[PDB]
Design an enzyme around this catalytic site. Structure first.
Site, PDB file in Angstrom:
ATOM      1  N   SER A 135       0.787  -1.257   0.000  1.00 15.45           N
ATOM      2  CA  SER A 135       0.000   0.000   0.000  1.00 15.45           C
ATOM      3  C   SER A 135       0.829   1.325   0.000  1.00 15.45           C
ATOM      4  O   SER A 135       1.464   1.562  -1.069  1.00 15.45           O
ATOM      5  CB  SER A 135      -1.198  -0.102   0.959  1.00 15.45           C
ATOM      6  OG  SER A 135      -2.234   0.800   0.644  1.00 15.45           O
ATOM      7  N   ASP A 165     -11.365  -5.795   0.714  1.00 13.97           N
ATOM      8  CA  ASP A 165     -10.373  -5.051   1.513  1.00 13.97           C
ATOM      9  C   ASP A 165     -11.082  -3.794   1.984  1.00 13.97           C
ATOM     10  O   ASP A 165     -11.457  -2.955   1.160  1.00 13.97           O
ATOM     11  CB  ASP A 165      -9.174  -4.686   0.610  1.00 13.97           C
ATOM     12  CG  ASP A 165      -8.090  -3.893   1.306  1.00 13.97           C
ATOM     13  OD1 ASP A 165      -8.331  -3.380   2.411  1.00 13.97           O
ATOM     14  OD2 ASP A 165      -6.994  -3.835   0.716  1.00 13.97           O
ATOM     15  N   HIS A 224      -6.460  -6.406   3.988  1.00 15.51           N
ATOM     16  CA  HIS A 224      -5.583  -5.407   3.417  1.00 15.51           C
ATOM     17  C   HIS A 224      -4.132  -5.848   3.343  1.00 15.51           C
ATOM     18  O   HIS A 224      -3.372  -5.252   2.573  1.00 15.51           O
ATOM     19  CB  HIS A 224      -5.713  -4.109   4.216  1.00 15.51           C
ATOM     20  CG  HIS A 224      -4.950  -2.965   3.660  1.00 15.51           C
ATOM     21  ND1 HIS A 224      -5.143  -2.515   2.372  1.00 15.51           N
ATOM     22  CD2 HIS A 224      -4.018  -2.150   4.205  1.00 15.51           C
ATOM     23  CE1 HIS A 224      -4.350  -1.478   2.153  1.00 15.51           C
ATOM     24  NE2 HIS A 224      -3.656  -1.221   3.251  1.00 15.51           N
TER      25      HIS A 224
END
Length: 268
Positions: free
Chosen positions: A93, A215, A244
């Protein structure tokens, strides 16, 4: 040195270097199940981003790390210190997005980006759904500092899509709560305030976007939005995973997917 301050670790060997960049709440130990599949074929550079609990709090500049760009520029410096170029960067991320921004400035340093659960922004607008509403986020953040642990523990099982008592949850919390609390709150606020959309059309390095099917931090449509707005070639692969941090919680599904995007280019 900057690399020492980021706990840089080098392993493997090979004409090509893979750089592994952990995301929020973890450190380079998150990659421990992936490394065995790389070590014979690639040199591998692992590092911890500044403010991870394994880093020295004296080096955490609250002004620089209140926006993602500080992380991007720190990454360039690390690659340069180790004479890395044309790397395969694998990030979770915010780290994948930090590398995307870095690659605008230094495309020579990146051959491709492999991006686990990326999002360019969390907060909804009229035209863009990131998953979070501004006026709710404002309430939550107002009392974040005094509630950091209870909020983080309370939400982590949905964030990770695994039970509070699971091994994955034990592992995430170990590193999350290793951060100094004020540093964790600074990084948290930075993430919540992201808006990297203006950069996307200038990213030209190939991007490999790997997503869970469910997610809470990344609406599935964000994957398509990235493909349509990134300036170079991309691929989007949604996996039969939830959470996630599928690399942490569902490695049996996720590692093979990540490997394949490391090993196989979509261009040249």
């Amino acid at each position: 040195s900057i690399g020492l301050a980021h706990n840089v670790t080098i392993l493997g060997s090979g004409e090509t270097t893979v750089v592994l960049g952990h995301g929020y709440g973890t450190d380079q130990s998150v990659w421990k199940l992936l490394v065995p599949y790389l070590v014979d074929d690639y040199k591998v550079l692992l590092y911890d981003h500044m403010g991870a609990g394994t880093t020295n709090p004296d080096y955490f500049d609250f002004d620089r790390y209140s926006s993602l760009e500080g992380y991007s520029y720190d990454l360039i410096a690390i690659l340069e210190e180790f004479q890395v170029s044309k790397c395969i960067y694998v990030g979770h991320s915010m780290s994948s997005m930090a590398a995307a921004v870095a690659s605008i400035f230094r495309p020579d340093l990146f051959h491709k980006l492999v991006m686990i659960s990326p999002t360019p922004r969390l907060i909804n607008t009229e035209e863009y759904y990131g998953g979070f509403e501004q006026k709710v986020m404002d309430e939550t953040l107002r009392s974040l500092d005094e509630n950091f642990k209870s909020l983080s523990l309370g939400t982590a099982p949905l964030l990770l899509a695994c039970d509070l008592e699971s091994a994955a949850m034990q592992e995430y919390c170990r590193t999350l709560f290793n951060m100094r609390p004020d540093i964790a709150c600074c990084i948290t606020r930075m993430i919540c305030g992201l808006d990297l959309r203006p950069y996307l059309g200038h990213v030209t390095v190939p991007c490999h976007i790997i997503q869970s099917s469910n997610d809470i931090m990344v609406p599935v449509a964000v994957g398509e939005y990235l493909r349509k707005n990134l300036g170079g070639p991309s691929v989007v692969e949604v996996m039969p995973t939830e959470g996630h941090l599928p690399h942490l919680s569902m490695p049996e599904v996720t590692i093979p997917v990540v490997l394949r995007h490391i090993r196989q280019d979509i261009t040249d």
